[PDB]
């Protein structure tokens, strides 16, 4: 029987500093006296882990959380209120879900189509003691997996990592003593693998299961309970293994410039000097496409709006060439009753080129319109107007009862006999005008092409560009080059384009590469200080924050995107060092007469 415990609204979140926690043994491989670099899903250092108070002191708030790419879970309790977890997607009888419950003697893991309660919990009764899982779910069917082992679970701090990769649900755990409250401890401790379950189910959401004592919802009581939840990310770590195969330390390579240097050098100690650790690249912000204006549109209207159309047995043809075929004009027209295309889609026509276009036209009955197609037979299809099975082109038609019909019968239109079209004829008997656009594509120069769409021109920014088919990436600026009237773009001595004429304005623009270069970290040495300065080589200081993607970095890395201390040198942009007007012996060389040293802070 399910009861309603979550009668209170959700409380606001609290956060704790992870410091250095959530690191686990990435595999079952023995490594000793070695620094190993691994890429895996880890809890980032010094991240904000959410601190939940499922039972506050009798406020019950024990929410369903997202699983994302794996979860770090921790708790500090002696009351044994936390017993287990539910993992799954829908978390109802529609899908398989994973139920992990620990108890006094064992741990029971089941995967079934569980129908869970709205706010599920483990029922504990005292008589001896009794436990009931019927307060977690009302029923379970189609069980696919079952596993039973020993229990998974100052004060004791329990840490777990939950991953679900390639159908395997991996659990890591560690149990340590702690004498702190309302926080997570400082220091390093790696989590050893606990179990690997070959389950093969999808997990997107999970919920912590608590035990409540029977001493209806108002009859369930338990003491205060709280836990921490973090999330794993694709991170590179440098792990330090000691002589016994135990991980004793670790570096989060994306935490800061110093950690990045350590991971590059594969060492937890860095000597005084300057090291290149990475590179920056400026990315394009817009895509710019420019073409010449439209000079000549194809004379299709001359066919569709013809005063008179030919008879079906003697259909007329117009040749279309040396023009721009804006087919969207006819396709989006409300003046047509039908528009069908074979071998080509009517919505792609504006992007195509043909060697010839032909427009065939005639007058037929409504019940004859269906005959104007590939694979057709009939009086018209066979004797008057035949299209091939592999025909490429579009058949367009419309009613002409207000034009081609006459009182007494219009016998001017004939077929292989006269029609005798009348204004009072039924739909299938009324006259219809048909135009067929045949598209010829031979091994020859194109004569008909659709219109080219152009965008606005952007200057002084890193963009992608396309100038009349000439493509590339770079920065477009006004040029002082003098092109001859027939020259469209220029090249340097290396045969690379460095200037283009804008096809609409005829303005000459210079093309420069989007800023790029190395990133070097300047350090006094970790035996002296953990202060660093970062040099951005061959870049302007104004551009730095956008070259390193500051918004995608940690707060610690974002301090070095800019700041009060920004010094422009010939070597690049130096950030974090204070420039002085004194002169000393060179300590750490930067270039072009500039050196840096630690004097305490880093100076240039």
């Amino acid at each position, epitope marked *: 029987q399910c009861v309603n415990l979550t009668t209170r609204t959700q409380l*606001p*979140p609290a956060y704790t500093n992870s410091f250095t926690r959530g690191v686990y043994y990435p595999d079952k491989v023995f490594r000793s006296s070695v620094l190993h670099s691994t890429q895996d899903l880890f809890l980032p250092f010094f991240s904000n882990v*959410t601190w939940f108070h499922a039972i506050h002191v009798k406020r019950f708030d024990n929410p369903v*959380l*997202p699983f*994302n790419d794996g979860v770090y879970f921790a708790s500090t309790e002696k009351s044994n209120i936390i017993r287990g977890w539910i993992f799954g997607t829908t978390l*109802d009888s529609k899908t398989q879900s994973l139920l992990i419950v620990n108890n006094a003697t064992n741990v029971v893991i089941k995967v079934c189509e569980f129908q869970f309660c709205n706010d599920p919990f483990l029922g504990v009764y005292y008589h001896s003691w009794m436990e009931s899982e019927f307060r977690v779910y009302s029923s379970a069917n189609n069980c696919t997996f079952e596993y039973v082992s020993q229990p998974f679970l100052f004060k004791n701090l329990r840490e777990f990592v939950f991953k679900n990769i390639d159908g395997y649900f991996k659990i890591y755990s560690k149990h340590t003593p702690i004498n702190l409250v309302r926080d997570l401890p400082q220091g390093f401790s790696a989590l050893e693998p606990l179990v690997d379950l070959p389950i093969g189910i999808n997990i997107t959401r999970f919920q912590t299961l608590l035990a409540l004592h029977r001493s209806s919802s108002s009859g369930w009581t338990a003491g205060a309970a709280a836990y921490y939840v973090g999330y794993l990310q694709p991170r590179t770590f440098l792990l330090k293994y000691n002589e016994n195969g135990t991980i004793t330390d670790a570096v989060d390579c994306a935490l800061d410039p110093l950690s990045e240097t350590k991971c590059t050098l594969k060492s937890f100690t860095v000597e005084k000097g300057i090291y290149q650790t990475s590179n920056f690249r400026v990315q394009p912000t817009e895509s710019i496409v420019r073409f010449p204006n439209i000079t000549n549109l194809c004379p299709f209207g001359e066919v569709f709006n013809a005063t008179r159309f030919a008879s079906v047995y003697a259909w007329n043809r117009k040749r279309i060439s040396n023009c721009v075929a804006d087919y969207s004009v006819l396709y989006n027209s409300a003046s047509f009753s039908t528009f069908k295309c074979y071998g080509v889609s009517p919505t792609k026509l504006n992007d195509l080129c043909f060697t010839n276009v032909y427009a065939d036209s005639f007058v037929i009955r409504g019940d004859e319109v269906r005959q104007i197609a590939p694979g057709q037979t009939g009086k018209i299809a066979d004797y008057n107007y035949k299209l091939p099975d592999d025909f490429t082109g579009c058949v367009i038609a419309w009613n002409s009862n207000n034009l081609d019909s006459k009182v007494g019968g219009n016998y001017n239109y004939l077929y292989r006999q006269s029609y005798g079209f009348q204004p009072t004829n039924g739909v299938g008997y009324q006259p219809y005008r048909v135009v067929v656009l045949s598209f010829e594509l031979l091994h020859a120069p194109a004569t008909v092409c659709g219109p080219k769409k152009s965008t606005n021109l952007v200057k002084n920014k890193c963009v992608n560009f396309n100038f009349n088919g000439l493509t590339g990436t770079g920065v477009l600026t006004e040029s002082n080059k003098k092109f001859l009237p027939f020259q469209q773009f220029g090249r340097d001595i290396a045969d690379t384009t460095d200037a283009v004429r804008d096809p609409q304005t005829l303005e000459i623009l210079d093309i420069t590469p989007c800023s790029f270069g190395g990133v070097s970290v300047i350090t006094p040495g970790t035996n002296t200080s953990n202060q660093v300065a970062v040099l951005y080589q061959d870049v302007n200081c104004t551009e730095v924050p956008v070259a390193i993607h500051a918004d995608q970095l940690t707060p610690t890395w974002r301090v070095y995107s800019t700041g009060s201390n920004v010094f422009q040198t010939r070597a690049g942009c130096l950030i974090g060092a204070e420039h002085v007007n004194n002169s000393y012996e060179c300590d750490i060389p930067i270039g072009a007469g500039i050196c840096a040293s630690y004097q305490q802070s880093i100076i240039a």
Partner: antibody, heavy 121, light 107 residues
Framework: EVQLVESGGGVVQPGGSLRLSCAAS????????MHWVRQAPGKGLEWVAF????????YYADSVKGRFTISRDNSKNTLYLQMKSLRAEDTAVYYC???????????????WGQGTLVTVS | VIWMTQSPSSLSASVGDRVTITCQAS??????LNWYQQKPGKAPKLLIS???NMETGVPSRFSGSGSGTDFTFTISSLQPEDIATYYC?????????FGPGTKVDFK
């Protein structure tokens, strides 16, 4: 407790650009994926974009692909939508939202902002 | 891309009447369909998730069911406060899509 506040709307010209932002509070923003949804005057709801909790994988509607970019700053609890080369057809009220999704975002709760109007003309 | 449609596009009903809205998918969205209720000037509110799972706070008069391509939303006893445009959303795969929306008016 939970709030989502859009801003950065206004009136721009065709071929121009506009960046929207949404301030999140009252929940663990950095644990959830986020969506943008737009609703033109007289029209229904159109899904625009989705970004995962870690700010990594990005998804867009076919109607905006190649023009719109979605991003987030998890240190400021702010969601962004960068739209460039906006056309008249892009006039709509733009919402930031946390849409309940048992398959992708893993959200168990459904939250919406107020909506900010963007006009292109 | 999965296309979504709704029928009728608009219906009128009085208080106490039973109101049903049909939503269809061009593909199999399994049970992955959200039902939203939107009133003028406000953001959409979720009433049902995963085809038939009611959201907390949603009146018992609201219900829904379906699987695959054919889903139904029902109000067992329409109230004056239930006048809104209802939308279906599929979330089987990205991009996510909404149906045209069905407007429920007052008889």
């Amino acid at each position: 407790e939970v709030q989502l506040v859009e801003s950065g709307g206004g009136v721009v010209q065709p071929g121009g650009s506009l960046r929207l932002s949404c301030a999140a509070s009252g929940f663990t923003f950095n644990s959830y994926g986020m969506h943008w949804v737009r609703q033109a005057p007289g029209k229904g709801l159109e899904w625009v974009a989705f970004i995962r909790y870690d700010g990594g994988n990005k998804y867009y509607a076919d109607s905006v692909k190649g023009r719109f970019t979605i991003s987030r700053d998890n240190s400021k609890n702010t969601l962004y939508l960068q739209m460039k080369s906006l056309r008249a057809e892009d006039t709509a009220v733009y919402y930031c939202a946390n849409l309940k999704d048992s398959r992708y975002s893993g959200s168990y709760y459904d939250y919406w902002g107020q909506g900010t109007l963007v006009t292109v003309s | 891309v999965i296309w979504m449609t709704q029928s009728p596009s608009s219906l009128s009903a009085s208080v106490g009447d039973r109101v049903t809205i049909t939503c269809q998918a061009s593909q199999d969205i399994r049970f992955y369909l959200n039902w939203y209720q939107q009133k003028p000037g406000k953001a959409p509110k979720l009433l049902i998730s995963d085809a038939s799972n009611m959201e907390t706070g949603v009146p018992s008069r609201f219900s829904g069911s379906g699987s695959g391509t054919d889903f139904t939303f029902t109000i067992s006893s329409l109230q004056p406060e239930d006048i809104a445009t209802y939308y279906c959303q599929q979330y089987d795969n990205l991009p996510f899509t909404f149906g045209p929306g069905t407007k429920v008016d007052f008889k």
